[PDB]
Amino acid sequence: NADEWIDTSKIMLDLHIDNMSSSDYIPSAIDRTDLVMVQSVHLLRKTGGRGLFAREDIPKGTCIGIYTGEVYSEQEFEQYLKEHVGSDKSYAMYVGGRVIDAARKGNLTRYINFSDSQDNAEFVETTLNRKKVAKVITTKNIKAGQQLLINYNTYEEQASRYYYFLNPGDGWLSAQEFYQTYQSQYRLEQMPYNLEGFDLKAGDRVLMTQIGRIILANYSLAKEQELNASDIDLPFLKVGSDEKILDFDEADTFTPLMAACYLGQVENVKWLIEHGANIDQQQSHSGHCPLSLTLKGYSLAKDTQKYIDIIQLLIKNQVNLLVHDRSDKTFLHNAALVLNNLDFQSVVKFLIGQNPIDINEYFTYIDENDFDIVMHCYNNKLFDKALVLLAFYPDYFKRNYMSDNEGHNQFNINAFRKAIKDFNSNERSILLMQLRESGLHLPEDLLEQLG
Ligand SMILES: Nc1ncnc2c1ncn2[C@@H]1O[C@H](CSCC[C@H](N)C(=O)O)[C@@H](O)[C@H]1O
Ligand SMILES: [K+]
């Protein structure tokens, strides 16, 4: 037997996997156990969650391994779920008409946690002994010690409503251990003003870096010499009433860039971005990021222009506009709600000017009500912003209602009808006027189906 030459006990000892029997670890020949390691994810400690981390720098496009597991046909797997109380699909990979369930048996790939806006790796179909399987390939350069994150390419309402928003920087250390490790970069300070956008009142104790203190004082980073860009994304660490640090799962931290965005410090935002701040960083519980926090600051401000400028900076630096809150609203969703008509138009114009490859990507994300951004505008009666979106992307109806996928087309017709179900005669005639506008070239039959 050839498996007698495979020592999975040593594989797991080398990877730091401590919650699998050796007879349940299923290696593949392309597994790069030299490049990765399994560790606890401190954020997930209350469920003993683990993750897969880079043991060294990994170049973009490197193969990590094969998603191994127990093999079922689709029918067999449904029968399994039906017969095994408490089993679920958390580890089930649907590929090639088969199901590869890594819930009980598998390899290192079973430890990669989820993100759809900060994934640095992806599942891709490959061939193995003439059958289709899933392999993991990095989609960005990974720095040693960062967690690998991957999009599961499925919808799970429980996921959007209960998962944490994981970052590549979320590791095995607690907030206490992180502070101890980098103590010389932190100083304890008292908040001198309220800051509801991060749930801080005047007088709260917070551990801050020099960069963070500069942001909170409203000083300019560019005027400072001897700034240590290493801790640019090291977080503000809140300190509890018992004078102990709040752990990562007890309170969201934030970065200097998050704060600069919320506060509208345009030049500081530019400086932070140019010095490598993760413009896609997300707070663990809330999901708030530079984009959402800029929108928040805009909602609470007399000077809205600096926030529009910050959104412009972010978009110029390839910020991920497909990030979404817990209701699966993307940035365009929520910006439709927060920005006035002129500013919403200006931001869509910025995005236009970045010349996105697939504009339709922005129009295929649906929120918890199954509304894409156009349906969303209409359901909130933002006729002007709906027209702005239609002018941005005239092909919207063509590509999402008259595609070659009749299932998708009908789902979208039904979702559009749902979005407008509460219109009165006046709103319906305004909508029909917009839709009959020459530029969309909507066929009469689709118009019938829409109203
Ligand atoms: N972003 C996230 N926040 C919280 N839990 C997550 C998560 N991403 C993945 N998970 C957990 O991990 C499961 C996928 S298997 C991923 C490995 C798992 N964390 C483990 O230690 O075995 C999900 O069903 C969910 O329970
Ligand atoms: K403010």
PDB file of C-alpha atoms in Angstrom, residues 185-451:
ATOM      1  CA  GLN A 185       4.783  52.052  19.823  1.00  0.00           C
ATOM      2  CA  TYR A 186       1.819  52.794  22.121  1.00  0.00           C
ATOM      3  CA  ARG A 187       0.986  55.515  24.622  1.00  0.00           C
ATOM      4  CA  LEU A 188      -2.062  55.635  26.871  1.00  0.00           C
ATOM      5  CA  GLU A 189      -4.225  58.714  26.306  1.00  0.00           C
ATOM      6  CA  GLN A 190      -7.564  60.102  27.437  1.00  0.00           C
ATOM      7  CA  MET A 191     -10.054  60.987  24.721  1.00  0.00           C
ATOM      8  CA  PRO A 192     -10.382  64.811  24.759  1.00  0.00           C
ATOM      9  CA  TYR A 193     -13.701  64.864  22.856  1.00  0.00           C
ATOM     10  CA  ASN A 194     -16.610  62.544  22.200  1.00  0.00           C
ATOM     11  CA  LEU A 195     -16.369  60.342  19.117  1.00  0.00           C
ATOM     12  CA  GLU A 196     -19.667  58.491  18.717  1.00  0.00           C
ATOM     13  CA  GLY A 197     -18.543  57.070  15.360  1.00  0.00           C
ATOM     14  CA  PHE A 198     -16.275  54.709  17.332  1.00  0.00           C
ATOM     15  CA  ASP A 199     -18.299  54.548  20.582  1.00  0.00           C
ATOM     16  CA  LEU A 200     -15.877  56.668  22.614  1.00  0.00           C
ATOM     17  CA  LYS A 201     -16.819  59.337  25.135  1.00  0.00           C
ATOM     18  CA  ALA A 202     -14.564  62.110  26.362  1.00  0.00           C
ATOM     19  CA  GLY A 203     -12.271  60.753  29.055  1.00  0.00           C
ATOM     20  CA  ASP A 204     -12.091  57.163  27.812  1.00  0.00           C
ATOM     21  CA  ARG A 205      -8.651  55.563  28.019  1.00  0.00           C
ATOM     22  CA  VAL A 206      -7.218  54.538  24.632  1.00  0.00           C
ATOM     23  CA  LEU A 207      -3.809  53.182  23.608  1.00  0.00           C
ATOM     24  CA  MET A 208      -2.567  55.067  20.545  1.00  0.00           C
ATOM     25  CA  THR A 209       0.432  55.179  18.262  1.00  0.00           C
ATOM     26  CA  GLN A 210       2.123  58.441  17.292  1.00  0.00           C
ATOM     27  CA  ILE A 211       0.238  58.370  13.984  1.00  0.00           C
ATOM     28  CA  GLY A 212      -3.043  57.834  15.826  1.00  0.00           C
ATOM     29  CA  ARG A 213      -2.401  60.680  18.254  1.00  0.00           C
ATOM     30  CA  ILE A 214      -1.602  62.961  15.311  1.00  0.00           C
ATOM     31  CA  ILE A 215      -4.889  62.019  13.630  1.00  0.00           C
ATOM     32  CA  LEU A 216      -6.850  62.637  16.839  1.00  0.00           C
ATOM     33  CA  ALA A 217      -5.203  66.021  17.395  1.00  0.00           C
ATOM     34  CA  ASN A 218      -6.117  67.115  13.842  1.00  0.00           C
ATOM     35  CA  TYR A 219      -2.413  67.640  13.054  1.00  0.00           C
ATOM     36  CA  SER A 220      -0.842  66.986   9.647  1.00  0.00           C
ATOM     37  CA  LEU A 221       1.156  63.797   9.147  1.00  0.00           C
ATOM     38  CA  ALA A 222       3.065  65.292   6.199  1.00  0.00           C
ATOM     39  CA  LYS A 223       4.566  67.987   8.455  1.00  0.00           C
ATOM     40  CA  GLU A 224       5.955  65.345  10.836  1.00  0.00           C
ATOM     41  CA  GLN A 225       9.451  63.952  10.467  1.00  0.00           C
ATOM     42  CA  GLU A 226      10.560  60.575  11.847  1.00  0.00           C
ATOM     43  CA  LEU A 227       7.193  58.890  11.477  1.00  0.00           C
ATOM     44  CA  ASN A 228       7.442  55.097  11.672  1.00  0.00           C
ATOM     45  CA  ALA A 229       5.212  53.871   8.839  1.00  0.00           C
ATOM     46  CA  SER A 230       5.414  50.331  10.257  1.00  0.00           C
ATOM     47  CA  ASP A 231       2.511  50.853  12.678  1.00  0.00           C
ATOM     48  CA  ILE A 232       0.391  52.777  10.133  1.00  0.00           C
ATOM     49  CA  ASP A 233      -2.413  50.216  10.575  1.00  0.00           C
ATOM     50  CA  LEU A 234      -1.795  49.323  14.224  1.00  0.00           C
ATOM     51  CA  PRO A 235      -5.166  49.897  15.918  1.00  0.00           C
ATOM     52  CA  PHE A 236      -6.445  52.182  18.584  1.00  0.00           C
ATOM     53  CA  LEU A 237      -6.915  49.850  21.561  1.00  0.00           C
ATOM     54  CA  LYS A 238      -9.781  50.728  23.893  1.00  0.00           C
ATOM     55  CA  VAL A 239      -9.326  50.117  27.621  1.00  0.00           C
ATOM     56  CA  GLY A 240     -12.180  48.813  29.748  1.00  0.00           C
ATOM     57  CA  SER A 241     -13.590  50.143  33.002  1.00  0.00           C
ATOM     58  CA  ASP A 242     -11.539  47.580  34.994  1.00  0.00           C
ATOM     59  CA  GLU A 243      -8.436  49.198  33.427  1.00  0.00           C
ATOM     60  CA  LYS A 244      -7.774  46.154  31.212  1.00  0.00           C
ATOM     61  CA  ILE A 245      -7.560  46.240  27.426  1.00  0.00           C
ATOM     62  CA  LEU A 246     -10.682  45.271  25.517  1.00  0.00           C
ATOM     63  CA  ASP A 247      -9.975  42.127  23.519  1.00  0.00           C
ATOM     64  CA  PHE A 248     -10.653  42.042  19.778  1.00  0.00           C
ATOM     65  CA  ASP A 249     -13.962  40.190  20.235  1.00  0.00           C
ATOM     66  CA  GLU A 250     -15.047  42.535  23.045  1.00  0.00           C
ATOM     67  CA  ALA A 251     -14.783  45.827  21.108  1.00  0.00           C
ATOM     68  CA  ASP A 252     -14.059  46.896  17.543  1.00  0.00           C
ATOM     69  CA  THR A 253     -10.724  48.608  17.005  1.00  0.00           C
ATOM     70  CA  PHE A 254     -10.059  51.122  14.235  1.00  0.00           C
ATOM     71  CA  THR A 255      -7.040  52.284  12.256  1.00  0.00           C
ATOM     72  CA  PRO A 256      -5.671  55.806  11.810  1.00  0.00           C
ATOM     73  CA  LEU A 257      -7.090  55.747   8.270  1.00  0.00           C
ATOM     74  CA  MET A 258     -10.593  54.850   9.490  1.00  0.00           C
ATOM     75  CA  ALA A 259     -10.385  57.813  11.875  1.00  0.00           C
ATOM     76  CA  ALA A 260      -8.996  60.219   9.256  1.00  0.00           C
ATOM     77  CA  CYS A 261     -11.896  59.267   6.975  1.00  0.00           C
ATOM     78  CA  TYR A 262     -14.556  59.674   9.673  1.00  0.00           C
ATOM     79  CA  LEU A 263     -13.085  63.072  10.597  1.00  0.00           C
ATOM     80  CA  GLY A 264     -12.698  64.277   7.002  1.00  0.00           C
ATOM     81  CA  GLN A 265      -8.936  64.922   7.159  1.00  0.00           C
ATOM     82  CA  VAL A 266      -8.363  64.892   3.402  1.00  0.00           C
ATOM     83  CA  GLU A 267      -4.583  65.376   3.373  1.00  0.00           C
ATOM     84  CA  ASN A 268      -4.113  62.881   6.209  1.00  0.00           C
ATOM     85  CA  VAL A 269      -6.195  60.371   4.241  1.00  0.00           C
ATOM     86  CA  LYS A 270      -3.982  60.926   1.197  1.00  0.00           C
ATOM     87  CA  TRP A 271      -0.874  60.490   3.346  1.00  0.00           C
ATOM     88  CA  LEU A 272      -2.131  57.295   4.995  1.00  0.00           C
ATOM     89  CA  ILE A 273      -3.148  55.740   1.674  1.00  0.00           C
ATOM     90  CA  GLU A 274       0.182  56.637   0.052  1.00  0.00           C
ATOM     91  CA  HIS A 275       2.053  55.047   2.977  1.00  0.00           C
ATOM     92  CA  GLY A 276       0.247  51.719   2.659  1.00  0.00           C
ATOM     93  CA  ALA A 277      -2.819  51.856   4.909  1.00  0.00           C
ATOM     94  CA  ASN A 278      -5.289  49.069   4.122  1.00  0.00           C
ATOM     95  CA  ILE A 279      -8.070  51.100   2.486  1.00  0.00           C
ATOM     96  CA  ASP A 280     -10.330  48.033   2.796  1.00  0.00           C
ATOM     97  CA  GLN A 281      -9.847  47.441   6.535  1.00  0.00           C
ATOM     98  CA  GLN A 282     -13.073  46.470   8.323  1.00  0.00           C
ATOM     99  CA  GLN A 283     -14.097  46.586  11.958  1.00  0.00           C
ATOM    100  CA  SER A 284     -14.741  43.055  13.178  1.00  0.00           C
ATOM    101  CA  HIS A 285     -18.280  43.375  14.566  1.00  0.00           C
ATOM    102  CA  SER A 286     -19.752  46.384  12.756  1.00  0.00           C
ATOM    103  CA  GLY A 287     -18.101  45.933   9.354  1.00  0.00           C
ATOM    104  CA  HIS A 288     -17.400  49.664   9.142  1.00  0.00           C
ATOM    105  CA  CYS A 289     -14.571  50.554   6.771  1.00  0.00           C
ATOM    106  CA  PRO A 290     -13.060  53.751   5.303  1.00  0.00           C
ATOM    107  CA  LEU A 291     -15.884  53.931   2.728  1.00  0.00           C
ATOM    108  CA  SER A 292     -18.742  53.503   5.210  1.00  0.00           C
ATOM    109  CA  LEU A 293     -17.086  55.795   7.752  1.00  0.00           C
ATOM    110  CA  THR A 294     -16.572  58.504   5.126  1.00  0.00           C
ATOM    111  CA  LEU A 295     -20.289  58.217   4.351  1.00  0.00           C
ATOM    112  CA  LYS A 296     -21.008  58.496   8.086  1.00  0.00           C
ATOM    113  CA  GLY A 297     -18.881  61.627   8.451  1.00  0.00           C
ATOM    114  CA  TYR A 298     -20.620  63.103   5.414  1.00  0.00           C
ATOM    115  CA  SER A 299     -24.019  62.489   7.019  1.00  0.00           C
ATOM    116  CA  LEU A 300     -22.846  64.452  10.099  1.00  0.00           C
ATOM    117  CA  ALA A 301     -21.112  67.479   8.635  1.00  0.00           C
ATOM    118  CA  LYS A 302     -21.681  70.989   7.327  1.00  0.00           C
ATOM    119  CA  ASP A 303     -18.557  70.671   5.144  1.00  0.00           C
ATOM    120  CA  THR A 304     -19.564  67.765   2.915  1.00  0.00           C
ATOM    121  CA  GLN A 305     -16.960  68.541   0.244  1.00  0.00           C
ATOM    122  CA  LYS A 306     -13.995  67.100   2.145  1.00  0.00           C
ATOM    123  CA  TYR A 307     -15.883  63.806   2.425  1.00  0.00           C
ATOM    124  CA  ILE A 308     -16.594  63.770  -1.319  1.00  0.00           C
ATOM    125  CA  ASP A 309     -12.863  64.379  -1.822  1.00  0.00           C
ATOM    126  CA  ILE A 310     -12.040  61.456   0.475  1.00  0.00           C
ATOM    127  CA  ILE A 311     -14.413  59.183  -1.448  1.00  0.00           C
ATOM    128  CA  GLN A 312     -12.655  60.372  -4.608  1.00  0.00           C
ATOM    129  CA  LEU A 313      -9.232  59.527  -3.155  1.00  0.00           C
ATOM    130  CA  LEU A 314     -10.431  56.082  -2.093  1.00  0.00           C
ATOM    131  CA  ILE A 315     -11.907  55.347  -5.515  1.00  0.00           C
ATOM    132  CA  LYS A 316      -8.743  56.584  -7.233  1.00  0.00           C
ATOM    133  CA  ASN A 317      -6.777  54.040  -5.174  1.00  0.00           C
ATOM    134  CA  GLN A 318      -8.929  51.038  -6.206  1.00  0.00           C
ATOM    135  CA  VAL A 319     -10.929  50.832  -2.952  1.00  0.00           C
ATOM    136  CA  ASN A 320     -13.290  47.842  -2.969  1.00  0.00           C
ATOM    137  CA  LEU A 321     -16.731  49.327  -3.596  1.00  0.00           C
ATOM    138  CA  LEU A 322     -18.278  45.827  -3.416  1.00  0.00           C
ATOM    139  CA  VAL A 323     -17.785  45.726   0.354  1.00  0.00           C
ATOM    140  CA  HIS A 324     -21.168  45.359   2.030  1.00  0.00           C
ATOM    141  CA  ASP A 325     -22.808  45.792   5.423  1.00  0.00           C
ATOM    142  CA  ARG A 326     -24.769  43.036   7.180  1.00  0.00           C
ATOM    143  CA  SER A 327     -27.842  43.681   5.015  1.00  0.00           C
ATOM    144  CA  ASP A 328     -25.689  42.960   1.933  1.00  0.00           C
ATOM    145  CA  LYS A 329     -25.861  46.613   0.890  1.00  0.00           C
ATOM    146  CA  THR A 330     -22.786  47.610  -1.113  1.00  0.00           C
ATOM    147  CA  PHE A 331     -21.259  51.090  -1.149  1.00  0.00           C
ATOM    148  CA  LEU A 332     -23.497  52.227  -4.007  1.00  0.00           C
ATOM    149  CA  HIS A 333     -26.534  50.960  -2.082  1.00  0.00           C
ATOM    150  CA  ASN A 334     -25.795  53.043   1.010  1.00  0.00           C
ATOM    151  CA  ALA A 335     -24.366  56.053  -0.830  1.00  0.00           C
ATOM    152  CA  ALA A 336     -27.676  56.244  -2.674  1.00  0.00           C
ATOM    153  CA  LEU A 337     -29.252  56.713   0.753  1.00  0.00           C
ATOM    154  CA  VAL A 338     -26.713  59.121   2.299  1.00  0.00           C
ATOM    155  CA  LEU A 339     -25.495  61.379  -0.523  1.00  0.00           C
ATOM    156  CA  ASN A 340     -27.619  64.129  -2.007  1.00  0.00           C
ATOM    157  CA  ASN A 341     -28.418  63.989  -5.713  1.00  0.00           C
ATOM    158  CA  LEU A 342     -25.551  66.199  -6.903  1.00  0.00           C
ATOM    159  CA  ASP A 343     -22.947  64.387  -4.793  1.00  0.00           C
ATOM    160  CA  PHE A 344     -24.247  60.935  -5.737  1.00  0.00           C
ATOM    161  CA  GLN A 345     -23.950  61.977  -9.387  1.00  0.00           C
ATOM    162  CA  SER A 346     -20.414  63.244  -8.777  1.00  0.00           C
ATOM    163  CA  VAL A 347     -19.350  59.976  -7.125  1.00  0.00           C
ATOM    164  CA  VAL A 348     -20.809  57.856  -9.919  1.00  0.00           C
ATOM    165  CA  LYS A 349     -18.884  60.149 -12.287  1.00  0.00           C
ATOM    166  CA  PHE A 350     -15.647  59.472 -10.378  1.00  0.00           C
ATOM    167  CA  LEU A 351     -16.284  55.734 -10.674  1.00  0.00           C
ATOM    168  CA  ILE A 352     -17.030  56.175 -14.402  1.00  0.00           C
ATOM    169  CA  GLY A 353     -13.701  57.983 -14.725  1.00  0.00           C
ATOM    170  CA  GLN A 354     -11.833  55.048 -13.241  1.00  0.00           C
ATOM    171  CA  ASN A 355     -12.986  53.135 -16.367  1.00  0.00           C
ATOM    172  CA  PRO A 356     -14.049  49.921 -14.586  1.00  0.00           C
ATOM    173  CA  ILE A 357     -13.664  46.780 -16.673  1.00  0.00           C
ATOM    174  CA  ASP A 358     -17.002  45.191 -15.720  1.00  0.00           C
ATOM    175  CA  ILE A 359     -19.461  47.911 -14.728  1.00  0.00           C
ATOM    176  CA  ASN A 360     -22.142  45.220 -14.500  1.00  0.00           C
ATOM    177  CA  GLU A 361     -20.418  43.735 -11.450  1.00  0.00           C
ATOM    178  CA  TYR A 362     -21.641  46.742  -9.473  1.00  0.00           C
ATOM    179  CA  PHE A 363     -25.244  46.080 -10.566  1.00  0.00           C
ATOM    180  CA  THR A 364     -25.451  42.345  -9.763  1.00  0.00           C
ATOM    181  CA  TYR A 365     -25.064  42.532  -5.966  1.00  0.00           C
ATOM    182  CA  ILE A 366     -28.473  42.252  -4.298  1.00  0.00           C
ATOM    183  CA  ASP A 367     -29.255  43.166  -0.697  1.00  0.00           C
ATOM    184  CA  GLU A 368     -31.284  41.148   1.816  1.00  0.00           C
ATOM    185  CA  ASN A 369     -34.464  42.128  -0.081  1.00  0.00           C
ATOM    186  CA  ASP A 370     -32.962  40.941  -3.401  1.00  0.00           C
ATOM    187  CA  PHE A 371     -32.628  44.558  -4.608  1.00  0.00           C
ATOM    188  CA  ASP A 372     -29.682  45.550  -6.759  1.00  0.00           C
ATOM    189  CA  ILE A 373     -28.634  49.195  -6.681  1.00  0.00           C
ATOM    190  CA  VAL A 374     -31.201  50.265  -9.312  1.00  0.00           C
ATOM    191  CA  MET A 375     -34.094  48.391  -7.689  1.00  0.00           C
ATOM    192  CA  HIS A 376     -32.825  49.845  -4.406  1.00  0.00           C
ATOM    193  CA  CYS A 377     -33.078  53.441  -5.615  1.00  0.00           C
ATOM    194  CA  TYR A 378     -36.565  52.806  -6.985  1.00  0.00           C
ATOM    195  CA  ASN A 379     -37.769  51.121  -3.790  1.00  0.00           C
ATOM    196  CA  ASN A 380     -36.660  54.230  -1.890  1.00  0.00           C
ATOM    197  CA  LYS A 381     -38.163  56.509  -4.587  1.00  0.00           C
ATOM    198  CA  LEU A 382     -34.774  57.995  -5.534  1.00  0.00           C
ATOM    199  CA  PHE A 383     -35.837  58.554  -9.130  1.00  0.00           C
ATOM    200  CA  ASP A 384     -33.026  61.044  -9.775  1.00  0.00           C
ATOM    201  CA  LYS A 385     -30.352  58.659  -8.488  1.00  0.00           C
ATOM    202  CA  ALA A 386     -31.939  55.780 -10.408  1.00  0.00           C
ATOM    203  CA  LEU A 387     -31.606  57.861 -13.578  1.00  0.00           C
ATOM    204  CA  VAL A 388     -27.996  58.655 -12.662  1.00  0.00           C
ATOM    205  CA  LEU A 389     -27.329  54.914 -12.380  1.00  0.00           C
ATOM    206  CA  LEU A 390     -29.086  54.214 -15.687  1.00  0.00           C
ATOM    207  CA  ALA A 391     -26.986  56.873 -17.442  1.00  0.00           C
ATOM    208  CA  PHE A 392     -23.846  55.404 -15.883  1.00  0.00           C
ATOM    209  CA  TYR A 393     -24.798  51.946 -17.193  1.00  0.00           C
ATOM    210  CA  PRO A 394     -27.364  51.948 -20.022  1.00  0.00           C
ATOM    211  CA  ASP A 395     -26.954  48.162 -20.547  1.00  0.00           C
ATOM    212  CA  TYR A 396     -28.391  47.380 -17.092  1.00  0.00           C
ATOM    213  CA  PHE A 397     -31.709  45.990 -18.354  1.00  0.00           C
ATOM    214  CA  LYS A 398     -30.116  44.394 -21.420  1.00  0.00           C
ATOM    215  CA  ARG A 399     -27.556  42.503 -19.361  1.00  0.00           C
ATOM    216  CA  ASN A 400     -29.643  41.555 -16.303  1.00  0.00           C
ATOM    217  CA  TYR A 401     -33.172  41.178 -17.717  1.00  0.00           C
ATOM    218  CA  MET A 402     -32.541  39.963 -21.291  1.00  0.00           C
ATOM    219  CA  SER A 403     -29.487  37.743 -20.831  1.00  0.00           C
ATOM    220  CA  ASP A 404     -29.254  34.116 -21.979  1.00  0.00           C
ATOM    221  CA  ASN A 405     -30.056  32.992 -18.403  1.00  0.00           C
ATOM    222  CA  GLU A 406     -33.857  32.970 -18.260  1.00  0.00           C
ATOM    223  CA  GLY A 407     -33.814  32.055 -14.578  1.00  0.00           C
ATOM    224  CA  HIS A 408     -31.785  35.168 -13.756  1.00  0.00           C
ATOM    225  CA  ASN A 409     -33.890  37.324 -16.075  1.00  0.00           C
ATOM    226  CA  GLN A 410     -37.125  36.282 -14.379  1.00  0.00           C
ATOM    227  CA  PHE A 411     -35.683  36.594 -10.870  1.00  0.00           C
ATOM    228  CA  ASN A 412     -34.695  40.161 -11.740  1.00  0.00           C
ATOM    229  CA  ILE A 413     -38.092  40.988 -13.263  1.00  0.00           C
ATOM    230  CA  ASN A 414     -39.760  39.705 -10.092  1.00  0.00           C
ATOM    231  CA  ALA A 415     -37.342  41.620  -7.855  1.00  0.00           C
ATOM    232  CA  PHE A 416     -37.973  44.823  -9.818  1.00  0.00           C
ATOM    233  CA  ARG A 417     -41.743  44.359  -9.561  1.00  0.00           C
ATOM    234  CA  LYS A 418     -41.286  43.767  -5.827  1.00  0.00           C
ATOM    235  CA  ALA A 419     -39.231  46.953  -5.458  1.00  0.00           C
ATOM    236  CA  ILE A 420     -42.028  49.097  -6.935  1.00  0.00           C
ATOM    237  CA  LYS A 421     -45.018  47.197  -5.509  1.00  0.00           C
ATOM    238  CA  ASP A 422     -45.985  50.120  -3.236  1.00  0.00           C
ATOM    239  CA  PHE A 423     -45.910  52.873  -5.884  1.00  0.00           C
ATOM    240  CA  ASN A 424     -48.954  55.038  -6.477  1.00  0.00           C
ATOM    241  CA  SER A 425     -50.224  55.935  -9.940  1.00  0.00           C
ATOM    242  CA  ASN A 426     -48.049  59.069 -10.011  1.00  0.00           C
ATOM    243  CA  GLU A 427     -44.827  57.276  -9.076  1.00  0.00           C
ATOM    244  CA  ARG A 428     -45.685  54.538 -11.578  1.00  0.00           C
ATOM    245  CA  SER A 429     -46.069  57.063 -14.395  1.00  0.00           C
ATOM    246  CA  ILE A 430     -42.805  58.799 -13.428  1.00  0.00           C
ATOM    247  CA  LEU A 431     -41.092  55.402 -13.531  1.00  0.00           C
ATOM    248  CA  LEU A 432     -42.644  54.520 -16.887  1.00  0.00           C
ATOM    249  CA  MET A 433     -41.478  57.861 -18.269  1.00  0.00           C
ATOM    250  CA  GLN A 434     -37.936  57.072 -17.136  1.00  0.00           C
ATOM    251  CA  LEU A 435     -38.053  53.543 -18.573  1.00  0.00           C
ATOM    252  CA  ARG A 436     -39.515  54.663 -21.909  1.00  0.00           C
ATOM    253  CA  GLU A 437     -36.661  57.176 -22.145  1.00  0.00           C
ATOM    254  CA  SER A 438     -35.158  56.567 -25.569  1.00  0.00           C
ATOM    255  CA  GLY A 439     -31.651  55.582 -24.428  1.00  0.00           C
ATOM    256  CA  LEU A 440     -32.491  52.248 -22.801  1.00  0.00           C
ATOM    257  CA  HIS A 441     -34.146  50.785 -25.937  1.00  0.00           C
ATOM    258  CA  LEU A 442     -36.385  48.668 -23.722  1.00  0.00           C
ATOM    259  CA  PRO A 443     -38.658  46.362 -25.760  1.00  0.00           C
ATOM    260  CA  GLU A 444     -42.381  46.829 -25.252  1.00  0.00           C
ATOM    261  CA  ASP A 445     -42.859  43.333 -23.801  1.00  0.00           C
ATOM    262  CA  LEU A 446     -40.254  43.824 -21.065  1.00  0.00           C
ATOM    263  CA  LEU A 447     -41.933  47.139 -20.244  1.00  0.00           C
ATOM    264  CA  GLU A 448     -45.225  45.259 -19.889  1.00  0.00           C
ATOM    265  CA  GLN A 449     -43.606  42.727 -17.560  1.00  0.00           C
ATOM    266  CA  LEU A 450     -42.065  45.489 -15.435  1.00  0.00           C
ATOM    267  CA  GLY A 451     -45.247  47.458 -14.698  1.00  0.00           C
TER     268      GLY A 451
END
